[PDB]
Each structure stands twice: as structure tokens, then as C-alpha cells.
Amino acid sequence: GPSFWLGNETLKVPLALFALNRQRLCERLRKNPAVQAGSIVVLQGGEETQRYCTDTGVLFRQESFFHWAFGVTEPGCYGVIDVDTGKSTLFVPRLPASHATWMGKIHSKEHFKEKYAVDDVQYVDEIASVLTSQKPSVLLTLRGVNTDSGSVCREASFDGISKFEVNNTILHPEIVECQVFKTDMELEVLRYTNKISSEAHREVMKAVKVGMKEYELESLFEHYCYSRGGMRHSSYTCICGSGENSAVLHYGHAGAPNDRTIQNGDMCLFDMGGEYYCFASDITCSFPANGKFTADQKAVYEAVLRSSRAVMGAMKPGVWWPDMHRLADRIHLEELAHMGILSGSVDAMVQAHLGAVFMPHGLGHFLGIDVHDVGGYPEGVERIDEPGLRSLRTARHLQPGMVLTVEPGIYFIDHLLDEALADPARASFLNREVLQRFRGFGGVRIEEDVVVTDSGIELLTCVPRTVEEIEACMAGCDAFTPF
């Protein structure tokens, strides 16, 4: 069967991947007692956009649910699936003659049928007529709430849809639940995105020099991923935090745009992940700008390495993800006590939520077509109302096929530290004279992507992690030399 491929050494992704997703979705809907025979899933693809009211085109990236089901890269499409038979129909825009001048070849419907291995291809302007002839009982459309953005996913619509019976409640929970469990074909793509992004992280560690701007490494990373990996997009805006900016969790956005000069003595926290054919990677490396950990940097770093490997060591089916978050909290507190930043009973520190002062984010999240993938909080799964834990993007138990990030960190964040020092229940644990030395340290995050297996996990990421590995990598003389 056909494959998506960007040539060179890039991954061939079989279009059978998306056919399998459609089949799995149908199989799940068929078991839902509320789904009527003769139902048809109706999805609307993303459309071309421009910047504001300008005619400056925005590079099109497909909507994630549509991509999961069809793998279609072109804007302006719809796709439907007959639930009972699994038959798929792709609807493509009927393009004007001038498209040939400005945009490229006007491909035939047969070209698209062969390209995407769907059962049928029609034009978008025929969708009402085509669906009518199929005499569906009900159209199943996609509407629901993303539990990370809080946004409502907008359901498909077309001229004439009002003439049909439409249900917009059944589909969203079902397709989300399919996306949560990755197929072997999807795992092959996530192995690849992690391979290329890991290589890119290594090249960045080799390239970093005191005096560079943070964004020079953002640029280098994205250049490696695109030129060598075929990754035209990143999975999220690159986070290239040096010095105190490494305490800012999502540093790098337009308001803080990776524009600091890296200085001797800084820690770097680089959270970057290329995207291939709308599949994510999400990796963070932490390391000294000058290639040599100081004693304080080694201590903080190895604390996070300890929680990282303890969590990965414990992860297996049936483990409750909030228990892993609490395990990381406890290890951080133990290590910060060993360092002298903390004193007293770690049990009591845990009871006072002191861990969240140092790690004010969730331990990790589902990953897939989106970096913060869907399905973390389905109906019946509640958010835990405690510092740190309330930022968890899922409170589920682990099962095979789930893909998770494992991303403990320790940060020295002034407003959180100051709050803790004002609270007698927490201040007694904090040694002010030692902590003072760590003001402006930034932080350390060690982020791996893993897959839950029957007996444990599979690690997808492959970057240097021990202090020795990191220092060796940064001192390496050799491979990637743009102009």
C-alpha cells in the first residue's frame, strides 16, 4: 500500500495506519448501544487561513482528529465513515483552473483515492447529495471539550446538513478513547519523531557556546529536524531557557522570545520536539552552558535524574499516574534535604505539599498527534485539587499502548518560594541561608517519551542523561555543519 514519505532518510508511514484507526473507531462505535445502524461519521478537515485580514498565507497543518482518521494533508476536505461497513469517503475541493498556475497540479479524484487508500473520493460541493443517496440514519459529528485548552471542538457543517439527523455527543468520547491507545504503526512514527528530535538535541548540546543567543539553538534544532527529518513543523514552540529563564516552564513564546545571551555558569533547559506528519515528540534536555556541572548544578540535576528513573522503573499497567507524581515529589524533597536546602521530616513536607513549590506542574501527559494529547480526563476521571497534582493532564491508571511523557523537574521560582517562606507550615522546612544561593538558578527538567507495555515501559527518547554522558557529549569535536 501507499506511504507518506519525504525522501532521503525520512520515515515511510503507511496509509494503512489511518485505515486501521477508522476500523478501530467503527469497532468501538458498533459496541456503543446508543449508536443506530446506518450511522455515518462526518468529519470536517482544516481550512486554509491567512494572517488577520492580509493575503499572507499561513502554512497549513491538518486538524488533529481529521488527521488521526485520514492522514490528509490538503486543506478544505471532509471525510466520512460508514459505521456498519467501515467504508471511507474523502471529499476534496473542486479547484478552479487558475489553481494550476498559482498552486500546482489539479489532481484527479482517482489520484486522491490511490494516495490515501480510501474507498471513494467525491468533491466537497457534492457532500449533501452523496450523503443523501446513502440514506443514513444519523450523522455522527465531533463536538466536545479539550481538557487542556478548555476549548470546544467545533463539529462539521455543510450546506444542507440541517436536512439530516445529527448527533454531536456520541463521537467525541469514542474517538478520543481510540487515540489514547497507540497502534504499532503509530508507535513506529513516535519512535521516529523521538529519534530525530534526540539527534537534534545532541547536535544542540554539541553546538552550545557561551555568548550565543538562546534562539540560535532553537534555529539549529528546527533546521536539523526539517532538513534531516522532514519535520516542517515543531510540535510546540521551542523552549530554550538559559539561566533564570530555565525556571519559566513554557519560556520562548512571543512575550519571552528566547532572546537571552547564554552566560558562563548558566544552566540550560531546552524543551524541543519536532513534528513528523502531525505526530509529536516532546523532549527536554538540561545541561550546563559551559559543559561542566558545578557541585550545585550536579546536585539539582541528579535529583531530577533520580525521580526520572524511579518513575520509569515503577511504571507498568495498573499504576495510578498521580502516585507516580507523588513519588517524584517525595524523591525531590529527599534530595533537596540531602543538599541542605531542606531540613526535617520528609513525611511532613509531603503532607504540607512542599513538593509542588519545586515542581509546580504535572509529572507528565499523554502524547500523540498533539503534544498534550486528548483523553487525560474522560468522564469518571477527576482532577485532584492539590498543588502540583491539579496541573496533571491525566489522573488515569496506566494501560498498554498509552504514550506518556515523564518530565519531573526542580525549579527555583521566586513567587512560589516566597509564598512557602511566609507559611509557617512550610517555612520550617526551608533553610533560608542555603536556599538564597539557589535564587536565580533557574531549574532542571528531564523529559523522556515512553510507551506503556504489558510489563513496564518502552523508552522512545535517546539523549545523554548522566552528568558524565552530558559532559562527554558537549566536549565532542565532531557532524552537522550548516554554512
Binding-site entries for a dipeptide? 250, 282, 372, 393
Determine if 447 is a binding residue for a second copy (CB under 8 A): no
Q: Which residues contact 150 (CB under 8 A, 6 or more apart)?
A: none
Q: How many Cα neighbours within 13 Å face the side chain of 238?
A: 28
Exactly one of 174, 203, 282, 449 binds ligand [O-] (CB under 6 A); that residue is 282
Determine if 448 is a binding residue for ligand [O-] (CB under 6 A): no
Exactly one of 82, 266, 373, 447 binds ligand [O-] (CB under 6 A); that residue is 447
15 to each of 113, 148, 280, 432, how far by Cα in Å?
A: 11, 29, 18, 58
> What is the spatial distance between Cα 235 and Cα 180, in angstroms, rounded to a whole number?
18
CB of 88 to ligand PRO, least distance (A): 34
Region binding a second copy by CB under 8 A among candidate stretches 124-132, 183-191, 414-422, 464-472: 414-422
Exactly one of 82, 216, 335, 407 binds ligand [O-] (CB under 6 A); that residue is 407
Supply the DSSP string of 23-55, one letter for each residue.
HHHHHHHHH-TTPPTT-EEEEE----EESTTSS
Contact 60, 66 (CB under 8 A): no
Q: How many Cα neighbours within 13 Å face the side chain of 404?
A: 35
Residue in 361, 365, 349, 411 with CA at minimum distance from that of residue 387:
361
Binding-site residue ranges for Mn(2+) = 271, 282, 365, 407, 447
Determine if 235 is a binding residue for Mn ion (CB under 5 A): no
**Size, binding site for ligand [O-] by CB under 6 A:** 4
The three grid cell numbers given for residue 148, joined into one nine-digit string:
487542556
Determine if 370 is a binding residue for ligand [O-] (CB under 6 A): no
> What is the spatial distance between Cα 442 and Cα 300, in angstroms, rounded to a whole number?
11
Contact 142, 167 (CB under 8 A): no
Residue in 130, 146, 47, 62 with CA at minimum distance from that of residue 90:
130
> Which residue blocks in 346-423 are alpha helix, DSSP H?
346-351, 355-358, 414-422
CB of 255 to a second copy, least distance (A): 5
Exactly one of 172, 325, 361, 396 binds ligand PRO (CB under 6 A); that residue is 361
Chain centroid, CA 477 distance in Å: 32
List the chain gaps (C–N > 2.5 A) by preceding residue: 478
Determine if 186 is a binding residue for ligand [O-] (CB under 6 A): no
What is the SS3 assignment for 451? strand
Locate cell 558545578: which residue?
294
Chain centroid, CA 330 distance in Å: 26
Residue 52 binds which entry of Mn ion, a second copy, ligand [O-], none, CB below 5-8 Å type-dependent:
a second copy
Residue placing its CB nearer to Mn ion in the complex, 199 or 271:
271
Determine if 222 is a binding residue for a second copy (CB under 8 A): yes
Supply the DSSP string of 102-171, one letter for each residue.
HT-----HHHHHHHHT-SEEEEGGGHHHHHHHH--S-EE---EE-TTT-PEEPPP--TTGGGS-EE-SSH
Exactly one of 365, 448, 451, 474 binds ligand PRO (CB under 6 A); that residue is 365
Contact 25, 69 (CB under 8 A): yes
Residue placing its CB nearer to a second copy in the complex, 53 or 422:
53
109 to each of 93, 100, 120, 130, 337, how far by Cα in Å?
A: 10, 16, 9, 15, 66
x-or-dash pattern for Mn ion, window 443-462, by CB under 5 A?
----x---------------
Residue 146 binds which entry of ligand [O-], Mn ion, a second copy, none, CB below 5-8 Å type-dependent:
a second copy
Determine if 256 is a binding residue for ligand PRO (CB under 6 A): no
Locate cell 485505515: which residue?
19
Exactly one of 172, 393, 396, 426 binds ligand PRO (CB under 6 A); that residue is 393
Region binding Mn ion by CB under 5 A among candidate stretches 133-141, 298-306, 345-353, 399-407: 399-407
Name which of residues 359 to 388 contact a second copy (CB under 8 A).
360-361, 370-372
Residue placing its CB nearer to ligand [O-] in the complex, 186 or 271:
271
Residue 362 binds which entry of ligand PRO, Mn ion, a second copy, none, CB below 5-8 Å type-dependent:
ligand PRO
Residue placing its CB nearer to ligand PRO in the complex, 63 or 407:
407
| DSSP designation for 437 | G
Exactly one of 110, 295, 415, 454 binds a second copy (CB under 8 A); that residue is 415
Determine if 448 is a binding residue for ligand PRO (CB under 6 A): no
Residue placing its CB nearer to ligand PRO in the complex, 136 or 243:
243
Name which of residues 210 to 249 contact ligand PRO (CB under 6 A).
249
> What is the spatial distance between Cα 405 and Cα 330, in angstroms, rounded to a whole number?
19
Determine if 275 is a binding residue for ligand [O-] (CB under 6 A): no
Exactly one of 2, 12, 50, 111 binds a second copy (CB under 8 A); that residue is 50
> What is the spatial distance between Cα 260 and Cα 214, in angstroms, rounded to a whole number?
6
x-or-dash pattern for ligand [O-], window 297-336, by CB under 6 A?
----------------------------------------
Binding site for Mn ion (CB under 5 A): 271, 282, 405, 447
Residues in contact with ligand [O-] by CB under 6 A are 271, 282, 407, 447
Q: Which residues bind ligand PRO (CB under 6 A)?
A: 249, 361-362, 365, 393, 407
